[PDB]
Design a protein around this ligand. Structure first.
Ligand SMILES: *[C@@H]1O[C@H](CO)[C@@H](O[C@@H]2O[C@H](CO)[C@@H](O)[C@H](O)[C@H]2NC(C)=O)[C@H](O)[C@H]1NC(C)=O
Lengths: 48, 48
């Protein structure tokens, strides 16, 4: 669902879906080649 | 007729091996995509 999300100070608006991306353990979020945020790790359940 | 047939047969090789042209359509696509990517990437600049 399209929501206004605030993940650990990273604020945006969008729809969240389950991901097949495999973050490195220290990585908290990710962005595209054009530096737009694409995936976020949830600081509670450590889910991408 | 034989000469025309031979030339039209060689066409399929002369269009993708000798290169030369066919790079202008790719140039158009690349230029438009690069312009769009730069326009998006300009959103990460502080501008002071
Ligand atoms: C944040 O707190 C919870 C506990 O409130 C931590 O553990 C979770 O606890 C719930 C309790 O129902 C379990 O169902 C979850 O599976 C637990 N989560 C995990 C990731 O194991 C949770 O780990 C904490 N988050 C941290 C430490 O990042």
């Amino acid at each position: 669902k399209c929501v206004n999300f605030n993940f650990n100070g990273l604020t945006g608006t969008g729809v969240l879906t389950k991901s097949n991306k495999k973050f490195l353990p220290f990585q908290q979020f990710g962005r595209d080649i054009v530096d737009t945020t694409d995936a976020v790790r949830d600081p509670q359940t450590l889910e991408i | 007729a034989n000469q025309f047939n031979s030339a039209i047969g060689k066409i399929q090789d002369s269009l993708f091996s000798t290169a030369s042209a066919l790079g202008k359509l790719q140039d158009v696509v690349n230029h438009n995509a690069q312009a769009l990517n730069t326009l998006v990437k300009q959103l990460s600049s502080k501008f002071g």
